Curated annotation (Swiss-Prot), chain A:
Protein role: May have histone acetyltransferase activity.
Localization per Swiss-Prot or TrEMBL: Nucleus
Signal peptide: none
Lineage: Eukaryota, Metazoa, Chordata, Craniata, Vertebrata
Tissue specificity as recorded in UniProt: Testis specific.
Record protein name field: Testis-specific chromodomain protein Y 2
Length: 260, 257, 259, 258, 256, 255
């Protein structure tokens, strides 16, 4: 397949999946982009690669959900649109939870909201030093997504995780790395060649050793991730179908656009 | 009316301030614990969105008042160690069961039970001059406040044992890096800043705040409960023994602080 | 007397010092493992309040002696990998089951099994010059020592995989920031600070120390047991396979020690 | 409430399934949300326990497939999402319920009407009632956590005779298999149930609730996990062409044995 | 070692522990009786037996906790006494949980309360047809003990378990056998000789095989039992340290 | 698709595997018969049947492991042979654990040791009324196999499980049905007739539905079964490579 909003590049030993949106700005996630992503992942699961590189094109890595888009739909019909909304997010998150091959994610810029919370679901997080990370859930008017309700407290402690989850604090690549969110930081000048050279190193390893490393790590966390996803989504379906949650989303979008 | 605490009902939040009169340095006796639990029970049932837990004086909380407790253990070992353990369990569980977010503001040193309760709260705000220690092996006790699981969870077992076994102190900056503290505040503007930040938190959607806490507390709650009971059972055993009382007396007669 | 370790029964603590003769740079063969288990079983029964696990020489423990195990696998794959995997499993379980606190002293590189057993101990005291690696992808192996769960628990999944999959080395200070090491020492005063702090710990209440260990280890023990079993099950599969034998044969032959 | 009758009494609240928007106490969306509402009220009131019973000749024939297949056939995607959401939340209300629930079974319990019974605490059945979970006849995988609760009370082989083979159990054989906990004679079923409920309502409220809590304790998470997995599967079956097809076949062909 | 409330017999291949109380009626359990049992259980763990036979003398196998005894102590100081009471129960129950050899329990009279809830902790339950079984906790005014909050639902399903735990119903030996509580029912006439024949048969088996069958079975459920015992005792302590809980026990003992 | 010891029938909606040994007595299991079953199951898994029917030919179902076969091997080389034996049992048992389609088992006569202990790993168990069941591990001189150390207590309680596991108890088809080991009992005259009617009934059901019921029911117990299989095999390895274990089997075979 060729995609509207993503580019896929099949190499020997690895498959590249590049978020490069056209129907949204700065790699925002709407329904269509998400189904393309899940589609590219499913295919990458089945091809002859040993691992996947998840990267993004342009300025930001992923700004998360496109609330400007979703708020129109929930305003039009909140009970249908939040069912669909929440079902596509859950499916998205589970695609990461279920993925058998290692996923290296390569972060070129800002990762926000759902663009940030999916990161812990991959196997290696490689950040450009100029990227920063935020899950401003309380600004959005939603509770956590992407299993960040367990993965953040697990990697940074509950207090530190709540600084992101409740207080909506941003983290530089180096702060995210210290808190476990990011596993390696790269100098900006040579980011993509350095990522390219390290990815090819990983692709030269035994495929079975790679799958087994990931399988063994994934054993005693997978059911926790499944449940967090299920629990988060249930909560989001009741918030996004509520009068306050819609209003909150509206309020957020009107403010976001109101700047010079 | 409260002898050892102050309760301030503010817009969207309730402030409980530790300010002891029956103890020095905000130390915890059974009486002080009782007040805090009741204050917390009241705050949970009121129309605030969250609780700010802070303290007054040079110290945040130096933990259990062992000078007070050792006297009671020497009177009646079995009664006093049991009441002591039962009141701690209840104290700890109140934090574990609490549905509203609790922000804790630490303006000075937090020692022993004063530091182990902090992981049970939602955010930990610390003055840069605050420091942290759980010198259980100096006291002559095993962990309290669930710290036997919470410390290993935030910092890994080794770093956690540096505190639990080796009795190491952490600066607010070191604690922040180790996950005990979530934000360090500058000394000059400490109280005004904490108040600005709590008010902004109290401006957030109440349901979003509770759901968020509910989703986080969710896969840890039973472990916390199990750990609280296990911790308290070991403490009752230690504090009812001659060896345990001897340790407490050693600490009270030898301590310099 | 042991041919690969020195045991110093001391006042309130027992020292187990890895100092192999049958292997180079404190590598682990079947004999070395067996002695360690012996010493740890004896130390579990003495009236020491705690164990200090140290080493002698320039390296702490470079992990599995692959030059030793490779011909042993090349001979009798099925039984030999069972032996090999069972002796590791037992070595690892001994740490998991140990009731007394273990303080480990690291005065050089800990590589592979030499590094993955550290999270099973209680305090990790490292010379600033010590470094840490689990280069599993280079060995041709899946994780061992329960590192499949312990590493992601202390440092998070992604940071753990930098070690487990990407084969990265950590300095003492970096290992400390990531949970693996609990105290870094200056090289000049390392062994003397370690001795004075061990004796301070040996002066604490024996019951209190045993109870701190029990409560901390409590909600993680079955996870460790299950992860050990699961990892050994996979290692039997890999080391008894054509490609896993070759990977080991390739490593011990191509390897040029950076320690 | 259109479809249920609540009867608070001394020490216990009775909730009677008595549908008028459906036949034979079938569960449609309306009926389910009334039941959840009534259960939530019962949780908040001063009763020590709940009696869940039914009016008419059938206890509950489960999902009203005639009602649901109309919705599924319009919009597979949205209707299967809504449908699974309402069942999950129904089932979850039983899972989370803190007071003992005694269920009084007066007639056939079928499909979801039998799969909820193990989520209650005592099951008292008329000797003339029978039990069936004909999932393979409907064309669905199990619901109500019966994928784990049936194997747990009677072993997997016997559970699959219900779940796969579609076999009926009399009240007596359901009793031997642990699904029913007491069988009563038919003539004065309601009189005898009522005296035993009054006996149970004489017990300490805290003791009753601690007994519930200590049992539900061991199994609550497994129940939530089974509910979750089943609903995931049903979302896939009911939004598929095979699934809709199976449900229409069922609705159109052969009518009721209750 | 001599005991006042139990008789221990070291036979060839098995040890027989007989509950035969002198300080209680109907083989009721008070602190000292429980202590003597834990002691004889530890001794039998250590001896050369392949397995233990657990039985009782008299018309009643075991009527459970001696509430007359305990209520006196709880009256004095409920706080302190409920802990002591709950800790000796926990330890008793844990002694069965951790026991590594097979225990065969032989029941020739009513087993009531704690007297019945320990049976699922044993390995084989052999009962006279005239034996019956009851856990009338709601009559006592307590929540479950002996791990019965998980052992009864796991053997009979939750609804059937609650007919015992909540409704306090009695099961005949036959009914308890159909429910998995009893594993073999014997006709009354030659009950003890029949039991003795069968225990010697079991003792003929390889000791390691016997210990290994037990360890592999117990392995899957050991934590759950320990946690059940933990929760149950925590709840019993808060019931027996309350006004309501002492009232319940007072009423029960007075009515008697 | 050719087998010495089993007849496979790729039928309409279902595949029937018939145990009919020649290399052993009474459908007994040795390395080769076990390896044939595994291959035949793996093939059934891959074909377009919606379910598997596991039957046996003649008057006995399966008397379990052939100890006359195995004990010569153990005596010859206890370490190698006890490991080989334990590895093939593990893979056989795991084949049942991991199986995605329902398996109906048709039990025509006695099921003994591993012949009875695999029964709980299947989904439906239909027994001729004259069929009986035993797992006499304490007579063989071994610990449990087939996951029966967890599956027996989960279906019947721990006490009734040890009647079988420790006490050598034999269940009639009726008692086994009452204990949850058998799901249906069929009167003698009409066993094979009825089994065939009923399996055709089930093969008329939706394939995905059948596979989903199996996946949902297995879900909850999968890891426990795997851990029990691993655990049992470890202990058996120990017993079968010990003098007392070899002594036990030898005695059993001589008697």
């Amino acid at each position: 397949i060729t995609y509207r909003d993503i580019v896929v590049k099949k190499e020997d030993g690895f498959t590249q999946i590049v978020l490069s949106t056209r129907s949204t700005e700065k790699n925002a996630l709407n329904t269509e982009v998400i189904k393309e992503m899940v589609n590219a992942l499913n295919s990458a699961a089945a091809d002859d690669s040993k691992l996947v590189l998840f990267s993004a094109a342009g300025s930001v890595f992923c700004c998360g959900l496109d609330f400007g888009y979703f708020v129109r739909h929930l305003r039009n019909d909140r009970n249908t649109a939040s069912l669909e909304m929440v079902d596509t997010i859950k499916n998205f998150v589970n695609t990461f939870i279920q993925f058998k091959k290692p996923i290296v994610v390569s972060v070129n810029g800002p990762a926000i909201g759902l663009g940030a919370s999916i990161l812990p679901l991959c196997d290696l997080v490689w950040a450009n030093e100029k990227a920063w990370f935020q899950t401003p859930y309380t600004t959005f008017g939603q509770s956590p997504d992407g299993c960040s309700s367990i993965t953040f407290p697990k990697m940074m402690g509950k207090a530190s995780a709540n600084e992101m989850l409740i207080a909506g604090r941003k983290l530089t690549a180096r702060e995210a790395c210290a808190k476990g969110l990011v596993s390696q930081v790269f100098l900006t000048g040579t980011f993509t060649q350095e990522v390219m050279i390290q990815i090819k190193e990983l692709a030269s390893y035994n495929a079975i050793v790679l799958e087994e490393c990931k399988a063994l790590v994934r054993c005693n966390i997978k059911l926790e991730l499944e449940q967090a996803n299920e629990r988060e989504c249930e909560v989001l379906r009741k918030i996004w179908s509520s009068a306050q949650g819609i209003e909150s989303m509206l309020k957020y979008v009107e403010n976001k656009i109101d700047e010079f």
